Amino acid sequence: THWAFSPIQPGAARNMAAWQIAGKKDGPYQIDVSWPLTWSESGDASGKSANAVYLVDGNALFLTATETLRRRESHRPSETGTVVIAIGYPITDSVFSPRRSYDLTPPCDHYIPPEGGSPKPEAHGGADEFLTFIAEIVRPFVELKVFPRVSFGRTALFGHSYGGLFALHALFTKPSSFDVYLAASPSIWWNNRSILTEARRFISGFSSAHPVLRLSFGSREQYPVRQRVESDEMFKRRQRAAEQRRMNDNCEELYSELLASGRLCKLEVKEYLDEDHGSVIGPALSGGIMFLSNLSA
Amino acid sequence: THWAFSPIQPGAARNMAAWQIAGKKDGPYQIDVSWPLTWSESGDASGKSANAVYLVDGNALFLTATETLRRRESHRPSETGTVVIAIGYPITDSVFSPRRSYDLTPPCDHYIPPEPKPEAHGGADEFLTFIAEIVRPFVELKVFPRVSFGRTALFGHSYGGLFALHALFTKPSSFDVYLAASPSIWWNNRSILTEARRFISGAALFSSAHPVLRLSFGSREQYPVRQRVESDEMFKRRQRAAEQRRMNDNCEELYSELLASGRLCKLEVKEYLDEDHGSVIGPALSGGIMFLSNLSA
Numbered sequence: 288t289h290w291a292f293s294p295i296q297p298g299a300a301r302n303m304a305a306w307q308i309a310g311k312k313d314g315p316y317q318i319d320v321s322w323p324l325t326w327s328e329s330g331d332a333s334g335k336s337a338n339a340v341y342l343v344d345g346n347a348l349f350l351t352a353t354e355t356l357r358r359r360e361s362h363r364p365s366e367t368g369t370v371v372i373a374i375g376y377p378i379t380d381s382v383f384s385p386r387r388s389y390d391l392t393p394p395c396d397h398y399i400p401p402e403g404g405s406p407k408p409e410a411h412g413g414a415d416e417f418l419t420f421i422a423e424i425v426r427p428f429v430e431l432k433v434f435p436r437v438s439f440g441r442t443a444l445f446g447h448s449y450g451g452l453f454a455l456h457a458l459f460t461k462p463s464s465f466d467v468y469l470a471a472s473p474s475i476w477w478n479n480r481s482i483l484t485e486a487r488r489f490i491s492g493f494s495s496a497h498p499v500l501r502l503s504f505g506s507r508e509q510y511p512v513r514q515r516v517e518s519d520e521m522f523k524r525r526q527r528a529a530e531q532r533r534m535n536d537n538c539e540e541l542y543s544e545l546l547a548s549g550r551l552c553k554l555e556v557k558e559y560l561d562e563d564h565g566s567v568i569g570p571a572l573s574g575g576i577m578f579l580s581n582l583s584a
Numbered sequence: 585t586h587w588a589f590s591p592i593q594p595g596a597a598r599n600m601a602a603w604q605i606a607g608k609k610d611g612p613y614q615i616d617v618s619w620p621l622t623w624s625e626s627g628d629a630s631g632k633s634a635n636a637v638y639l640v641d642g643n644a645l646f647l648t649a650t651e652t653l654r655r656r657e658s659h660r661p662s663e664t665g666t667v668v669i670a671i672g673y674p675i676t677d678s679v680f681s682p683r684r685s686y687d688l689t690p691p692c693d694h695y696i697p698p699e700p701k702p703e704a705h706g707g708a709d710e711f712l713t714f715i716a717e718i719v720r721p722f723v724e725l726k727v728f729p730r731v732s733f734g735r736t737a738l739f740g741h742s743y744g745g746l747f748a749l750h751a752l753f754t755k756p757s758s759f760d761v762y763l764a765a766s767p768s769i770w771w772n773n774r775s776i777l778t779e780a781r782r783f784i785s786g787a788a789l790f791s792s793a794h795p796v797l798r799l800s801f802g803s804r805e806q807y808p809v810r811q812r813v814e815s816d817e818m819f820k821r822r823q824r825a826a827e828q829r830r831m832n833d834n835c836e837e838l839y840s841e842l843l844a845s846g847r848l849c850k851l852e853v854k855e856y857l858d859e860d861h862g863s864v865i866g867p868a869l870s871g872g873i874m875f876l877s878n879l880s881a
């Protein structure tokens with residue numbers, strides 16, 4: 288047999304591109320963009336329309352969102368294709384950046400740092416700047432420069448942890464920013480639950496906005512399970528953090544408050560059984576993508 | 585602020601490569617390979633060992649597997665790194681190939697077409713030999729020659745899951761860990777059961793393999809949930825197909841039978857609530873990788 292191992296490009300990294308966006312003091316951003324496989328490698332959709340999903344912590348979520356959509360688009364070729372826009376950082380040894388703490392937390396009149404369990408201060412309060420950046424710089428670049436011949440129908444924002452907090456902040460203060468908000472394991476605990484002040488202002492008061500929200504969390508986030516290889520004290524640290532952060536109950540209570548207000552067009556909460564803060568990312572992102580695609584019909 | 589956009593490569597598609605493997609009767613294969621972000625761009629692990637996960641339907645699963653691992657590896661730098669090897673096809677407009685039907689189904693003396701929709705079938709022994717004797721030695725001896733591989737896993741979904749079970753039952757020493765997601769146990773009037781029975785009672789006295797198996801399925805696979813838009817007839821057709829395939833019960837009963845055999849050192853079955861045949865892929869793949877990483881701690 289004439290076996291040949293021939294290097295090829297792009298392989299599975301098809302119909303994706305990346306840009307650095309330089310200007311901010313903190314350093315450049317990295318945007319990763321992917322588009323449907325039926326479109327050309329130059330991004331030509333041949334007159335087709337699209338939806339779009341914007342991801343914060345872009346480096347950690349881009350590929351999962353891309354592939355989830357490509358599986359579904361393969362099964363359902365008549366469905367509207369979705370462009371993925373991941374907003375992240377020029378990082379090489381990891382998929383998370385410490386810069387996320389500033390970018391994803393909203394500015395507040397008073398600040399209480401997170402617990403390490405000593406106080407663990409980090410940069411904070413840049414969410415309004417970041418949201419402006421996405422809406423006024425990134426989004427128009429994608430729509431007007433990258434895909435000028437594509438009519439964009441539905442837009443979504445997904446974030447996990449501080450990303451979920453960011454998604455909630457966007458919903459409560461600028462509800463027309465996106466059509467759909469996907470807040471996965473949102474850090475509702477953050478800064479003595481300051482996001483609930485914004486939630487209640489949103490519940491009270493934005494006339495022309497009909498937002499959709501999907502909340503999610505892993506069942507183990509508030510109720511951790513000791514791993515096979517884990518020391519007693521390291522497990523007890525996780526128990527401490529879990530009880531303070533109150534992920535499961537904070538999500539369910541926020542869901543209940545928002546549901547009772549009737550201010551959302553559609554609202555859903557999903558508990559992912561047996562998933563923890565890290566392991567829930569894949570299922571919650573996949574689930575958010577499916578939730579988004581199911582809104583089309 | 586004067587934002588400066590500039591194209592960059594590779595963006596989030598770093599530490600990955602692809603080869604076309606030509607020679608086989610049916611046509612060329614495409615293998616996509618990714619490795620940890622802490623290793624070099626040329627695949628140098630600097631003496632580190634690794635696990636490996638081999639994926640069938642490679643075009644549809646490569647990026648999800650890759651990114652799931654990179655998220656975990658970023659939080660757990662001391663854990664054993666994992667190389668992803670996706671075995672797929674040179675396809676451009678979709679992530680699935682019709683060739684999968686032949687490659688993933690085992691040879692049988694009689695064939696019953698699935699409900700009637702006949703397909704090419706019976707190439708799984710040839711495909712397993714290809715993976716074991718052509719692909720794996722290329723990856724281990726040519727791509728990662730100084731990496732000592734600890735545990736190797738095989739993941740497949742649907743017909744891929746059937747393939748994973750076929751591999752386990754006929755050549756149990758092929759892989760250390762088998763991840764059979766929504767396996768098509770129903771296929772060809774449950775013809776896989778003949779091999780399952782032989783496996784159960786066929787262990788050698790000395791030096792027999794005791795592999796690891798994880799079974800999974802989505803709760804909606806056997807119990808579909810009606811959509812608003814669906815007619816009665818269209819929903820009834822989905823219910824009929826679900827009853828026939830019997831995904832949930834076949835998985836659970838295979839688990840029970842294999843548990844009683846005592847041939848597997850570790851055996852797990854997971855039902856993913858609210859997930860269907862397509863939506864369970866991400867969660868089951870992520871869950872399978874978590875499972876492999878947990879047993880490698």
Ligand SMILES: [Cl-]
Nearest residue numbers: 507511512563
């Ligand atoms: Cl846990």
Ligand SMILES: [Cl-]
Nearest residue numbers: 441579580583
């Ligand atoms: Cl949509």
Ligand SMILES: [Cl-]
Nearest residue numbers: 804808809860
């Ligand atoms: Cl269903």
Ligand SMILES: [Cl-]
Nearest residue numbers: 515878879880
């Ligand atoms: Cl384990």
